[PDB]
């Protein structure tokens, strides 16, 4: 009678940025997905490959809950086959993505009258991220061939840009909390089962 710690990912008081997204693994527990319905309110709920209505009658070997904060304009980028800065330099989902992406407006929690600048996103990178790859380097992006010796300027740009969430911002620029569930049934025996 061990319940999977899905709650500690959703109702958590603190969420991380998108360039430094958080991930919690799930294993050896009963995954009851009733909280995905009739609980609070979700602005976005896009499942790929799996039907959540049947998630209660399945068992998986690997389950991962990723969590971060973006803005509305970017919640569409959290999907397989998406482009842009978020899908290239921050958080990318593979083409054969088999999970779900949930997102809810958190303008009442992640917005201050003076502007919340604790949520950053990566702006420059040498190459695109591979599926489920996290980069937290603060090195000045050497845009050219001249070495940026810790000083910004021409062809020397800081890689992280602040969101600046404000309460008077439009819904497209308001903070949305995003949780991505990823299910994998590999050669190992499945342990993350649902009530069956």
């Amino acid at each position, epitope marked *: 009678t061990n319940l999977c710690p899905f709650g500690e990912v959703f109702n958590a008081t603190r969420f991380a940025s998108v360039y430094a997204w958080n991930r919690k693994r799930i294993s050896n527990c009963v995954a009851d997905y009733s909280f*995905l*319905y*009739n609980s609070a309110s*979700f*602005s*976005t*709920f*896009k*499942c*790929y*490959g*799996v*039907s*959540p*209505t*049947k998630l209660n009658d399945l068992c*998986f070997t690997n389950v991962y809950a990723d969590s971060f904060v973006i803005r509305g304009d970017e*919640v*569409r980028q959290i999907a397989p086959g998406q482009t842009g800065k978020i899908a290239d330099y921050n958080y990318k989902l593979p083409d*054969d*993505f*088999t999970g*779900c992406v949930i997102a809810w407006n958190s303008n009442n929690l992640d917005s201050k009258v003076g502007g919340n600048y604790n949520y950053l996103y990566r702006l420059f990178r040498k190459s695109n991220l591979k599926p489920f790859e996290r980069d937290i380097s603060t090195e000045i992006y050497q845009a050219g061939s001249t070495p940026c010796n810790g000083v910004e300027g021409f062809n020397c740009y800081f890689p992280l840009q602040s969101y600046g969430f404000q309460p008077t911002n439009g819904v497209g620029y308001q903070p949305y909390r995003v949780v991505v569930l990823s*299910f*994998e*049934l590999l050669h190992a025996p499945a342990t993350v089962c649902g009530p069956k």
Partner: antibody, heavy 119, light 114 residues
Framework: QMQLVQSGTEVKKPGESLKISCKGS????????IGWVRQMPGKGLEWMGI????????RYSPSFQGQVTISADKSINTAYLQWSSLKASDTAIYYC????????????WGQGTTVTVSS | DIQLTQSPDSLAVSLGERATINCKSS????????????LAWYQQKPGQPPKLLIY???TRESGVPDRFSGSGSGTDFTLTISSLQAEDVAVYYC?????????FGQGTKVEIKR
């Protein structure tokens, strides 16, 4: 569970717009992608398109790219299939089917609307 | 684009006999993440909308009898009806939900062989 109700049968003349509706009611509609499919007098089922009512993410079949439009109103849990000055080749029955995911088989089907287009 | 063709156009099977319908895809519809074939079989009777008979090429729906079985992997799949009853007279389609756009099969019409 999930249930989809479609509009009544329409009879129209060639050259008039039309908007078929598909309203959903059931458990957890926020996860359902609504897809439109055509069946002409005869035997074929041809996938027209799909849309997620959360945002406006719409995907069209290459045979229905510029001929039809697919919209959605999330406030009342409805999808819409719209023609503008349609032709006499559109006389058919149109179904809307719901799938709890994008790459999920169509679990719940509607009743289908009969569109009759004749001069 | 993925294309599906159903081998038997028409299928005349006597009452209580086995009926087989074949579906051949132009591409593989197997997901690496869960190793499941993304193919479904639907059934529609005259006048009614099509109901999802089976999904994942093998898994039966919550509301289907045990005579409707699905097998196959890769690109060849089979829908088998063990004891064909008078209710089973309908048109059966195979569709793929692997990638957009979705594609239905040709449509196999079954009948009680009198």
């Amino acid at each position: 569970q999930m249930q989809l109700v479609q509009s009544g049968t329409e009879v129209k003349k060639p050259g008039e717009s039309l908007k078929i509706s598909c309203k959903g009611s059931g458990y957890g509609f926020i996860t359902y992608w609504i897809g439109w499919v055509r069946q002409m007098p005869g035997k074929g089922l041809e996938w027209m398109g799909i849309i997620y009512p959360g945002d406006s993410e719409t995907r069209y079949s290459p045979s229905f790219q510029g001929q039809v439009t697919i919209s959605a109103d999330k406030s009342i849990n409805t999808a819409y299939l719209q023609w503008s000055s349609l032709k006499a080749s559109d006389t058919a029955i149109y179904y809307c089917a719901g799938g709890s995911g994008i790459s999920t088989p169509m679990d719940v089907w509607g009743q289908g609307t009969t569109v009759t287009v004749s001069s | 684009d993925i294309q599906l063709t159903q081998s038997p156009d028409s299928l005349a099977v006597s009452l209580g006999e086995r009926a087989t319908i074949n579906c051949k895809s132009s591409q593989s519809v197997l997901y690496s993440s869960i190793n499941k074939n993304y193919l479904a079989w639907y059934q529609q009777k005259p006048g009614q909308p099509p109901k999802l008979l089976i999904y994942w090429a093998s898994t039966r729906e919550s509301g289907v009898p045990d005579r409707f079985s699905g097998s196959g992997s890769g690109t060849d799949f089979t829908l088998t009806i063990s004891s064909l009853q008078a209710e089973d007279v309908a048109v059966y389609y195979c569709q793929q939900y692997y990638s957009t756009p979705y594609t239905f099969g040709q449509g196999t019409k079954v009948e009680i062989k009198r």
